[model samples]
Target: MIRAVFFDSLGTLISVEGAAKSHLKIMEEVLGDYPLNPKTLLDEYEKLAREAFSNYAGKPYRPLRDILEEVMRKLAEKYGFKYPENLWEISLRMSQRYGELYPEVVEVLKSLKGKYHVGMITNRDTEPATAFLDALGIKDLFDSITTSEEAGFFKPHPRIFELALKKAGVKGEKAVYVGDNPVKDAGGSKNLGMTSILLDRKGEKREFWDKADFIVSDLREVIKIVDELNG
Candidate 1:
């Protein structure tokens, strides 16, 4: 059985692709001939950040430059382009350009650090996961991190994976989770019983890809599926 693993910080272990190439080079210098590119402007800025986190649920946690200044003011009126009123300091300077960590994610999180209990559980909002795991030094290989503005709720929202399985003490069937969306981290950690793992890395063929219990595309195949689930 697993003991703990978690993870799912911005596309499963960082790599926002250098903040989507500095947000498409600041929308091509403020949209002067911006013919929608950069993967359709980061897929419409992750679809307006999941529609402003589902219409600003209870509101109060609005960082990421107020959801990229309301997704560049509704993608500047559906792409006619002309919205940057300093667009929240160009979306906080393209989210402080912090992406890097998928060259086999720090050697598969350093071979699953001492064999288990690594952590992260993010919907993001803890100073960009402690400044992107301390600028990819890996932030002491974590032990627990959890956010969705610190469990006010996000992800597929089983109270933010039950507050990351109660801070990784573990018990949602001993924990597993690894993520990359598909209903906010593998159907919310398989609806709170954990053991999800999806990662996918753009092998993109969806329809909830069978609601993941394992879909990996490599992060060392999640260390061979956690050594066949803790061997």
Candidate 2:
């Protein structure tokens, strides 16, 4: 029986694109190149940040704020601008005002509630991830929310998934993991023998289709997949 349903945060549970767009705007104001193509700047930030995650996973822990500062410093040096000390704090403040849930996320989560342990496994700090959840007013829907800091590893490393399984009180085979990122979310969960559902959302993850046991374009489909697994 599938006893637990685990979700990825960020792109999976919360859409950060609004917050992401504002972040680029903040960069333009703080960084020297105000007229820099926002797409190129955002792309560079994404590339550098993700590389930091992969490089540091399972070896040592770095708080996300620290990582952001590290990444910002690199951006500063590259663009020949003095690093803006207060930018992250500003970004943090604006984050709460952005990123609404998907239309179907609440209903899907509530449907699975009581029948299974609805849980989250995110590669984020405990406070901010929980804060984001609480801010969205959906924090109560989850039985547990595990973070990378508490797990001592990030997704694609299995340690965080292992921690989530432990929290949900289920073995790997008895849990189904849902995520937006194919490698970090689907591939990571599948590594532990859990069923993986890749939320492709907009047909964005075609290259990593094989990482998930199932793929769906909508969050509502998660309930169907879970029901079939447990039935």
Candidate 3:
């Protein structure tokens, strides 16, 4: 009995392209033509980000602000560039940049609201998450919102999913997890016996398609899947 639906915030519901562009713009503004290429810099930042989360998974949750700043500082030092004195403020601005929602998101979420509990689980701090939700004007759509900072665990970790399930008042098998990432979103849900639905809007042909119990090109398909489950 699928009584609830949980979603991944970034990539699944909203695009982080704006956030990526903001980071690139800030790097060019602060670092100039530092030896490393733009792609390399971004790659390093991502590498450090994964490590940061992995190291802190079982410990206290670290906010995105803190993790992003660390990446900025390390990159600055590596290139012999002066770190921005207001790095903290700059990080906030970069993260708080508005995000755009996928076209089908609003209608699908609205359709699901009355019939099933709708909630979100994000690997982000609640501050920026809340800001993005409000900016997109979908804050009230969610019945519950769980962030890594609040859950003390990130996706792919059972603890965070457990927290979301508890908040939704449903067991793993009674809810479906919808997200864009195969590993963090689908893999984690599958680990806990929850049905995993991957939102592959781009039609990317990949070998990992089997990881998700369902692959949807449109969010509306999620509604149909739930309908079948309910039947």
- Candidate models: Cα lDDT each: 0.72, 0.80, 0.79
Q: Across residues 118-219, which tens digit of lDDT does each residue of candidate 3 receive? A: 999988888778876887799999998988788787677787888889998888999999988885445657777799888888888367788788898888
Of the two candidates 1 and 3, the one with more favorable lDDT, higher being better, is 3
**lDDT tens digits, residue span 97-202, model 2:** 6657877889989998889999988887899878878888999999999888998876677788888898887899999888888754456577788998888888
Candidate 2: list runs displaced more than 4 Å: 28-40, 57-59
The stretch of ten residues in a row with the least summed lDDT in candidate 2 is: 27-36
lDDT of 1: 0.72
RMSD of each: 14.8, 2.2, 2.6
Ranking by TM-score: 2, 3, 1
Given candidate 2, what's the lDDT at residue 108? 88
Model 1 per-residue lDDT at 224: 81
* Cα shift from native, residue 198, model 1 (Å): 24
| Clashes per model (N, Cα, C within 3 A) | 0, 0, 0
Can you list the residue pairs that collide in candidate 3? none
TM-score of 2: 0.89
Q: Is candidate 1 or candidate 2 better by lDDT?
A: 2
TM-score of 3: 0.86
